[PDB]
Structure formats: structure tokens, C-alpha cells
Amino acid sequence: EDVKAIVALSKDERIGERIFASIAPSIYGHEDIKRGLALALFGGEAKNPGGKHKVRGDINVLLCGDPGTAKSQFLKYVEKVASRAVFTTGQGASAVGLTAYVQRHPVTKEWTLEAGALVLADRGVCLIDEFDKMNDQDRTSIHEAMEQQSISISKAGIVTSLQARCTVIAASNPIGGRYDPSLTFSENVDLTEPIVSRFDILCVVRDTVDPVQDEMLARFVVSSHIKHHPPNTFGVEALPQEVLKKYIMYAKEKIRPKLNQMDQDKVAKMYSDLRKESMATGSIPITVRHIESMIRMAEAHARMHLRDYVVEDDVNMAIRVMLESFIDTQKFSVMRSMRKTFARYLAFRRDNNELLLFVLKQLIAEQVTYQRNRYGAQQDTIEVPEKDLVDKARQINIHNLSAFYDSDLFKMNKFTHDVKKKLIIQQF
Amino acid sequence: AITPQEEEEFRRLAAKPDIYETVAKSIAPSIYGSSDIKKAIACLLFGGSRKRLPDGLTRRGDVNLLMLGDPGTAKSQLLKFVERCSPIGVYTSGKGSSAAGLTASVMRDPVSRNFIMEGGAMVLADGGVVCIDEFDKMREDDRVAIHEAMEQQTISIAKAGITTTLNSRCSVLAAANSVMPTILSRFDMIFIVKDEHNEQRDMTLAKHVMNVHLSARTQSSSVEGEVDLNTLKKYIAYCRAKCGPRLSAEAAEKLKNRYILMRSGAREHEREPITVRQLEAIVRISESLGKMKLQPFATETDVEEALRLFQVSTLDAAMSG
Amino acid sequence: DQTAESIKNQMTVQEWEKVFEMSQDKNLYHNLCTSLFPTIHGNDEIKRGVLLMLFGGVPKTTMEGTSLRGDINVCIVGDPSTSKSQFLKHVEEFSPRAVYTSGGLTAAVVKDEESHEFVIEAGALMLADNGVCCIDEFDKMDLKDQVAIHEAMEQQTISITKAGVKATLNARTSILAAANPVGGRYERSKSLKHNVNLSAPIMSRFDLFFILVDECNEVTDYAIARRIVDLHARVYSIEDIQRYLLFARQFQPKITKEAEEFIVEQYRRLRQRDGSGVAKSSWRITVRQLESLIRLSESMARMHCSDEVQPKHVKEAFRLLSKSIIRVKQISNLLVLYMQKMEETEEECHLTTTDLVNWYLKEMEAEIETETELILKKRLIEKVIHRLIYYDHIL
């Protein structure tokens, strides 16, 4: 009966939105983080190109952000959800060593094995916090351990190999205390280049003023205090946690996404165009590793919707995620140019009203900055002519603002449209 | 343990005039492109010819490479493949487990109180190839060991009273992301592996990777025009243990003229350089080619090819920097 | 015993009468501030902060297994000889559970090999559990001590691993660390990060970051000299204060809906203030400011013996927190000038160099009439060009 329930859920095409909403229900916003975490949890199918090479099925995630941006909450949720989860840290204070090492027993003078965090989390989800601070031995061994997923030792005849195949979901803080968009991702993070290169999905959590989200988060925190006293952004049903766990276990036991259905021509064209932009601009070039990450994310999506075959929608979603991460890792001007160039791929399965909301946010930011520059203080209500929004929508070939006004997202952000004055009014 | 049938096969294979290009293609079939690097690796694998003069000093016959370039160019896979094709080889990764030993060490077993004298990886790889990855991350002691082994080719152990000197005659093939200067000066050919944005090349590489991932199930598919790894091993061992070539008089004249012209041009350009060391490196490359074709004398074409390889690698590395 | 009425039963009738009198005092705030620190003159804000720390907040634990902080910490930074150590001395005198140190602190696992037992000697943090740990010379701590203090502030635990014995020891206490600015002179031009040599997480975890300035006020100097000479020449007693503090800590106020809405409004106002570029703040605000405000409101409710939080408590806490934060024309007009340039660049293709500058003169002059302002705008444009010309940098 549980299998039939899982099959029935697989029948519903729009289950991805459900499970994306389910990830970290207590956390508000950061939809990119939730999407990445869901993709990591569902995992990708691993392959073995003979003995010469091995293709790992893990989807690593790195979360570099700002202080007080709900980074540890995601790790806690993944620990509480995913089975075989190991929580560690790198700062110290009895922190478990990331990689195993052979240290001869001091009292008995015998060579012994001391397992690391990666070894204790094999076939599971490893979680690291404060990943920027690490021991030098760990700093030099993490690269190889993540590359080969196995630690091999040879000391005085003791030839032991330990298997460490785990999904790493790390977090850290940037250099200087804040993330500077002017500099590249590598400069902001106090980590060597190969270590960052090993991670597939890179997510940046910046801190910006969003008064609506500020008020909602304040309500959430105060209500949490009240509950412990002594809202669907995706707008779609949220799956039960237990049924979600059964679905995940099904997606790791009775499914094997094959890559027979593929369009290598479009992938090659995307690779060539992205490499053109990267090399011409002088920023970080796209390598084959990004292609492999895209393939793994595509297989993860295929398992996510319980399809034995990879529908081209999953390929487009994987390309979207990879492009979003890679573009966001660039410099500010480079990121702007790359967003301007690549817009068709990035717009796959994006709500038009969502883009209208982005345009409205831009206009509100303009008005607020103008008010603070001229009047010094701000104003409770913000009104901007609709004509600018209509023109920018025509630029993106969008229209029918009345349907957007009738949308619940328009009301939730405290927007009101004055037809008589042709003005959109927002209250705080 | 080689049967006469295999010897006949080796003679037939070496008799072909296109053995050089065949060996170049046979190296790392999976990796696409980089023909010049493959040719240089072939030259390294076959190696030069060792000589002894009446004074007792012996001129070494090894060839050393170095691959510098951006990450993501599959250096590690190439090094691993090279390690599996030489009759004798070893793989050490820099700063990872101290890159194996790389230093002959004298530890004391505490229970038995005995002293054990393990040689380094270089000693174990005598008369072979030593592939090192992450050359710039080397520990200082291993850096000293590398400096000593590349110059005198004798690793010495002086600790805890025990004082001996081991022997290590190995060709070093190392790859690093970016720049110790003395060791970089010791190397014969320095390849700066850049990247290109030819649309055809990028599309072909992406298609090849995608096809490999698609045919992970069809990994049993073979390749044509290449040489099996065991056959390559036996061929390398036979050529190394049978034929040691020497230069001819005409090749010597041509090389001397080219060297004189190069040095005069370099001096004139500096007024607006190639040294004897690089001349000997070119000599060793020519001898390696001659040994590869199983001949007792290296012709002028070998000298021309060695000059071309040197110009492609070391001269271009000097000019770019 | 944790029930307030239970301890009242333990207490005598006169003690209960005194407790009731203290609870009904309208000026209990000022009386407690004066009695707690009589010798020190001025600096009432720091006294109020220390009193709120002594009262503390209501701890909570989430259903998810996490635990919410119920303690607040205060760090004092001031010029030399500004009586900052006197605060710690009086706090230690009043508090029986206070543990004074001078920057061993965590634990000492000494194995009694005679009995083969790892007997652990409690450190400064352990002895100060469920109380206040005064740590003078906070800026002189070694890296190990800094790591231990940050771990104690983040996870309220003490982890020790000596001789292959890993253990975790609970430690829930408030820190009243005090330190001097780098160089002994507080530069108002520089922010708190530059003035004080402390690691970023440790600086971030702190609340009520009070700053002391000598100010060389002559009247205050006369008062100080007279106080010193008189020393050479209290509304409530310490016991009464201790009894009332225990009684108040036995309470547990809870937030109300009206107080909740007012808290949300005040947090919105504070975040708008921080985001405003009129005056640069010494430390950027986060959700931690909101959590600190909630803790301060709970402390105020405890002190006034009320069993529920009311908007007046939030008003007082917001005033104190706002006064805690210190804020460190040409740029004001330059921001809107950049706004106009960017908007015109997107809307219109034509973009000249000097002619657009001449137009921007009148564009900024649309609401003012001053030629001297126009020549000042030209000078500002010249300086900007000396720096950059609408370069691709952000903001």
C-alpha cells in the first residue's frame, strides 16, 4: 500500500514543487538553497567507466554567505531528515578529523587506525560547519578524499584502504565579514582553488534588506518563541516528511535513470557559448567538470520524478541550475553581462508574474534610494507609474498585468494597483 | 620471459616507417588532443642512451618532463597511464601522505628495537619512471631529496649513525598548476599546456565526454590503430634492453651549426639563451628516437624532430613567460 | 523550590514584605541602578545594561531539539583609567557565583593514576555556571582561549579531550568581558572592528556593546575629585537586592500579541535605520539584534515582576539598544546622481561625458537655487573623475 502511495505521488507531474516546499519548512526564502539540498538528497546514479575511471553519484553543496543568514538550520534539517548523517565541524573543540590517518599508539607503541569523519559517514550524508577553518593535514587530504572517495594508507606494512563515499554539504563565512560582489567567489572564500572546484553546486547567501521578508521572519521567530514557551512560497501542497522519506528510499532502491535519451548537440553548443563568454571576459572558464555536474543533476532530477529515463525537461533544469551557480560565481559586471547574454536557458520554467515581481522590486528599490538620497528619511507608502513596468515587460515580451494584479503573490507583498491614477502602491 | 613469436612481432612492428606516430597515438587513447605531449611522453618512455667515459664519469641518459597549465586538462590521468606503461614505475602525489616517502628513511621498530632501512620511492623506481603530481606542494625534505637525486642520481642516508648512499636512476615526469627554480632549471622539456577556444575542438571534446558517459554501459568497446598495454610494455622493455644508439657525423654537423646559429641569434637579440645543457638534452632526445626505431645510428631527421620538439616546448615556454 | 511561592514559604514574613515593597516600587529601576553601583559616578547606561544582564532572560527549547539562548552578554570598551574594571569588581562583590579572572579557564583533566580515574578540575567557566563570568583583559587572550570562549558562547558547552578522553561539559553563563581599544585611544572615525582587536564571531555574539569615553568634562572631574577626597575622608541593602533578584528570576514572563506587533514594528524601524546611508553604523544589524531585543524585553518584564511582556518594556529595551549603537551632503547628492546616470543609461542610449554633467547640474538643481552649489557639483564631478567615471563597479 505504501508502494502504491509512492506510485500515485509519482503520477502527479508537479511533485517537484511539493518536495521543494517540503525541504526546510521552518526556513523562509532561499529557494535556491532548498532546490540544491533536494537535488543533493535525491542523489545521482553513479557509474564506473571500467577500472581506469569511476563516476561518483554524489552532489556536493557549498554554502558561503553572511552572518545571521540561516546557514546552520539547513544542515540541522538535513541531519534530522537524511538517514546515516554525521555532523562535524572544522573549527576545533574536540572536532572530528575529516580524514582518517594512521597514528602509532603512544602507550603501546603500535601503529593504529583512527577513522575520520568521512569514513564514519560512508553511504551517507556528511555535514560540515565552519568549513573554512581546517587543519593543514585535513586541508591537504580533503581534496584527494573527495576526488577518489577512498583513503589509502601504507605505513610499515599496514596497507589498508578505507571507503569514504558520502555527500558533503558544507558551509563557511567569507573573508572580511561580508561578501563583496565586486570580487570573484574564490577571492571571497578562504579556501584553495581545487577544494572549491570539487564542489558541484555553489550557493551564495547575501544579506539584503527585504522589509516584507523581515516582517515575516520576525513573525516566525516570535511565534516560535511563543510555541516553545514554558506560508508556501511555491504555493503548492507540501509532502509529509515520512512519505517523503519513503519516496527518497524508493528513489535509491528501485530506479536507475538511463542516459539513452540525450541531445548532445544542444549541450555542446551550450558548452561552446559559455566557454566563449568566459574566455572572452577573462573570468573563470567552464571545464568538463561542469558538464559532469550537469549530468549528475539531470540524473538526480530523473530519480526525483521517478522516471527510468531522463526527460529533456530534467536536462533543461540541470542546465538552468548549473548556469545559475556558475554565473553567480563571477564578478558583478561579468555576472551582469552573462545574464544579459544567456537568458533563454535561465528562464526555463519561470513564472511571468515572478519576473514582474522582480521588476516591481527593482522599481521599489529605485524609489526608496531616491527618497533616502533626497528626503533623507523614507515614506510609508511607495507609488510608481505603471508605464515603466509595462515598458520593461514589453522588453521581456510580457503583458496582461491584470492577471498579475489578481495573483495572490501581488497581494502578499502588500501591493495595490490604482487604475485611476495608473500607480502601483505598496504599504509597509 | 619472451617467446620468439613475440620477438618476431616486435621486429615486424619496428620495421614499419610509421612506428613513431603509432606509438604517439597509442599513449592515452581516451584523452583527446595533445599530440605533441604524447610524442614527448613516448620519447621519455623510450629514454636516451647511457654512456661511460674512461675517466669513470657516466653521462646520464634520462629525459625529464614538466607539464604546467590550467587545471582540468587531465594531467593526473595521463600520469597514471604513463605509470602503467613503463616496465618500472611509481606514482606519488605531492603532500598527500608526504608523497609516499621520496626519501630513504631509517625508522626504529619500537617492539624489536631494530633499525629498518627502507629506501624511498625513487630507490624502488631505479631504472624506470617516477610520476609526481602536485609538484609545487612538495614537502621541504622531499624537495631536498628531489634536488639531490636529479643532480647526482645517488640518494644518501645519514641518520642515527648509519651512513650509506643508495642509487636512483629514474626519469622524473611531474605536473604542476603554476610556479624550486633550480629544479625547474634541471628539467629538459617544459610544456606550458594552455587552452584553446576553437569551436570545433570544444564541441568535439564535449561530444566525446558525453559519449563516454553514455557508453559507460558499453565500456567493453575497443579502439583501433593502437597498441595493447602489455604489448607496449614488452616492446619498451625489449628496445631498452637491446638497442643503444649513437649520433652520426652528419647529424653532429647539422646540430652544431643549428646550435651556433641559435646562440648567435640569442646574443644579438639580448643586445637589442641556449646553453650546452639544452644541447645535451637535444642529443638525448635524438638518441631516444633512434633507440625507438631500433637502429644503431640516429639520422638527420631525428635531429630535426628533436629540434622541433624543443622549439615547441622549451623555447615557447621561455617566450610566453 | 523553583516556584516563587515555595521560596517565599522558605522566606520569613518580613522578607516577603520587603520583597513586596521592592516589587511595588515605581522607581525600582533607578533605585537598583544607584544601589548596585554607588561609588561610580555617571555612566548610567552601562549600569542599566549590567542590571538587565543580572536579571537575565527566559530560556526556551525548540521542538526540533535545539535550545534557545536565555542569557545576554555585555562587553565594555573604554579609555584607560575610566573605571571599567571597577564594574567587574562590584559585580563580583555582589554576585556570590561570580568568577573573576584576568585572561585554566575551561577545565583541567588530571588523571589520578593511583585510582586510574580522570578527575577533572573545574575551570573558570565551569565554576561560573548559572551566573556571571567576569573576564577582564579580554583582548589579551590567546588563540586557544578565544576559540574556547567562542565555543562557549555558541554552544554553551565545554568540550575537552585529554589523554584520549573526549567529554562535553555544560556551561550556561553570561560574560561581562571588558577590554581596551587598540592603542588606548578610541578613534570615533573608525568602527568598532578597527578599534577593538577581537575575532569576528566573538564580536558578533555579544550584545549591549557599551563604549566609554573620557570626555574630559570639568564638572565631572570636580565631582570625581570630590568623591576621591571624601573616600579618603543605598535604598535597598545587598541582601534585599539578592532576595528580590532570586524572586524575579523565579518568574517567567511570556510575550503578548500587542508586544509582538510592537516588536515587529521596532525591528522594522531599526533595520530601516541601519540600511539608511545617512550615518554609517559601527556594526551592521542582523536577526541577532531582534533576538537581543526579545531577551531585553523579557529581562524588563522579569524586573518589573510582570508575568507578561507589555509594550512599555519593549519601548525601554529599544531605547537602550538604540543608544547602545553608535553611528560613525556630497555623497548624499552623489548617490542620486549615480541613480539618474544609471536610469538614463538604461532608458536612453545617448551618454555624453561633460554635457551630461552640465545637464545633471540642473537635474540636481531642480529643487534648489544656488550657483555655488553648481560649482560645488562641478568640483565633486572632478573629484569623482579623479577616482572613477561611472565604472562597472557595483553601487
Ligand SMILES: Nc1ncnc2c1ncn2[C@@H]1O[C@H](COP(=O)(O)OP(=O)(O)OP(=O)(O)O)[C@@H](O)[C@H]1O
Ligand atoms: N529564512 C530565514 N532567514 C533568516 N533568518 C532566519 C530564517 N529562518 C530562521 N532564521 C533565524 O535567523 C537566525 C540566524 O541564526 P543562525 O543560527 O541560523 O545563524 P547562522 O547562519 O548559523 O550564522 P553564522 O554564520 O554566524 O554561523 C536564527 O535565529 C534563525 O532561527
Ligand SMILES: Nc1ncnc2c1ncn2[C@@H]1O[C@H](COP(=O)(O)OP(=O)(O)OP(=O)(O)O)[C@@H](O)[C@H]1O
Ligand atoms: N581530453 C580531455 N581534456 C581535458 N579534460 C579531460 C579530457 N578527458 C577527460 N577530461 C576530464 O578532465 C578532468 C581532469 O582531471 P585531472 O584531475 O586528471 O586533471 P586536472 O584537473 O588538470 O588535475 P590537477 O587538478 O591535479 O592539476 C577529469 O574530470 C577528466 O575526466
Ligand SMILES: Nc1ncnc2c1ncn2[C@@H]1O[C@H](COP(=O)(O)OP(=O)(O)OP(=O)(O)O)[C@@H](O)[C@H]1O
Ligand atoms: N565616574 C568615574 N569615572 C571614572 N573613574 C572614576 C569615577 N568615579 C571614581 N573613579 C575612580 O577613578 C579611577 C579610575 O581608574 P581605574 O584604575 O578604576 O581604571 P581601570 O578601569 O582599571 O583602567 P585600565 O583597565 O584601563 O587600566 C578609580 O580609582 C575609580 O575609583
